[PDB]
Design a protein around this ligand. Structure first.
Ligand SMILES: CCc1cc2c(c(CC)n1)CCC(=O)N2Cc1ccc(-c2ccccc2-c2nnn[nH]2)cc1
Length: 393
């Protein structure tokens, strides 16, 4: 970690600034020397897709070579006995330190700064996120118990309904991180590792859900419209493998968040770094993660609802999770496209930019509100579940 070695340099400089003898300066500069050596092996936050041979990365590596040199002169002075002089040469780290934050950490976008930074958002969103997390954690963990004991994982539908609980449960585990981020007025105090994992976990939830909701739709279509000899041993085998592949595809689809997300200054923010290219990539996610599956899902359900309006309790559950999921993503879908128009230069108006940046935290809340609401859609099984509960004990 570059951020870790960067803290190793700043804290060891404070040791040198208060050091009395040369032995205190020697041991501090030795730790700093090894720190800048493996930090040279690393890649800065703004050069995520730059070959370790490009003039950009070479300028990064050369930067720490000068830093090693400044430390090497200070070590030479400490070995001679000069403490007051070794401390002066160590203070040259602050130049390289301020040169690194201005080159790779300051991401000044300006144009419409402090947009969507209203007093009610920093209070409304963390209070709403507290509820989604707490309600959803107890909700989905009860769903996992119900699937293992009431459903006993005997159907194909049961397997996908369990995986959706785990996927929803995973996203929920990262929710208090995004709650305090908003409460601290978009200040990220968890570093670079959690900025990447917490952003990839939000991305992963969308893809895995969309993939599971497609699988459950096809399952409902084939169960109701085209029934065939149920070879459970083979159907359970294919359903178990399909879910592994889903977690793999959603993992691979959320890889950009692990690559281009970093912590940057303006107050630190956990944001995506843009290299023309996002236009031809933002069009690829819509035609795969919303237009293509919702097309497959609707075709399955238009055929199944028609053949059932005159397994069904499960269909009600799968239909309610599918209908709510897509009607909650529409607000965010409109404003995400509108945010793209701000980032390009089509709509260059801070009055409009504010309306979009004040609504996006509210729209991303509703588009992820299903993780706490999905367990509540199991109420269709309530009359049959109380029948099992009483018969048990
Ligand atoms: C709902 C919790 C959540 C998140 C959040 C903020 C908030 C508080 C309003 N709450 C602040 C804004 C922000 O960037 N975040 C993180 C985020 C991470 C991933 C995605 C995402 C979703 C689908 C597909 C791709 C991505 C993606 N990958 N990399 N960058 N975006 C969107 C937002």
């Amino acid at each position: 970690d570059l951020e870790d070695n960067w803290e190793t340099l700043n804290d060891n400089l404070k040791v040198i600034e208060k050091a009395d003898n040369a032995a205190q300066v020697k041991d501090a500069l030795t730790k700093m020397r090894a720190a800048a050596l493996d930090a040279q092996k690393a890649t800065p936050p703004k050069l995520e897709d730059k070959s370790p041979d490009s003039p950009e990365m070479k300028d990064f590596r050369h930067g720490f070579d000068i830093l090693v040199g400044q430390i090497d002169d200070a070590l030479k002075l400490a070995n001679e006995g000069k403490v007051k002089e070794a401390q002066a040469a160590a203070e040259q780290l602050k130049t390289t330190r301020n040169a690194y934050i201005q080159k790779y950490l300051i991401l000044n976008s300006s144009d419409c700064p402090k947009a969507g930074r209203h007093n009610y958002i920093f209070v409304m969103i963390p209070t709403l996120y507290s509820i989604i997390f707490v309600v959803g954690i107890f909700g989905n963990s009860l769903v996992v118990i119900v699937i293992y004991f009431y459903m006993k994982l005997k159907t194909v539908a049961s397997v996908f309904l369990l995986n959706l609980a785990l996927a929803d449960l995973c996203f929920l585990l990262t929710l208090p991180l995004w709650a305090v981020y908003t409460a601290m007025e978009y200040r990220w105090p968890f570093g670079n590792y959690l900025c990447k994992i917490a952003s990839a976990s939000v991305s992963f939830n969308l893809y895995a859900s969309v993939f599971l909701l497609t699988c459950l739709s096809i399952d409902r279509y084939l169960a109701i419209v085209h029934p065939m000899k149920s070879r459970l041993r083979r159907t359970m085998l294919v359903a178990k493998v399909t879910c592994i592949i889903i977690w793999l595809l959603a993992g691979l689809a959320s890889l950009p968040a692990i690559i281009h997300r970093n912590v940057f200054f303006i107050i630190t923010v956990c944001a995506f770094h843009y290299e023309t290219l996002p236009i031809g990539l933002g069009l690829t996610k819509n035609i795969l993660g919303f237009l293509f599956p919702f097309l497959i899902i609707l075709t399955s359900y238009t055929l199944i609802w028609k053949a059932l309006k005159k397994n069904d309790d499960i269909f009600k559950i799968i239909m309610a999770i599918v209908l709510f999921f897509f009607f909650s993503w529409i607000p965010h879908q409109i404003f995400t496209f509108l945010d793209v128009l701000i980032q390009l230069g089509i709509i260059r108006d801070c009055r409009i930019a504010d309306i979009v940046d004040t609504a996006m935290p509210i729209t991303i809340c509703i588009a992820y509100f299903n993780n706490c609401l999905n367990p509540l859609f199991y109420g269709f099984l309530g009359k049959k579940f109380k029948r099992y509960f009483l018969q048990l004990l």
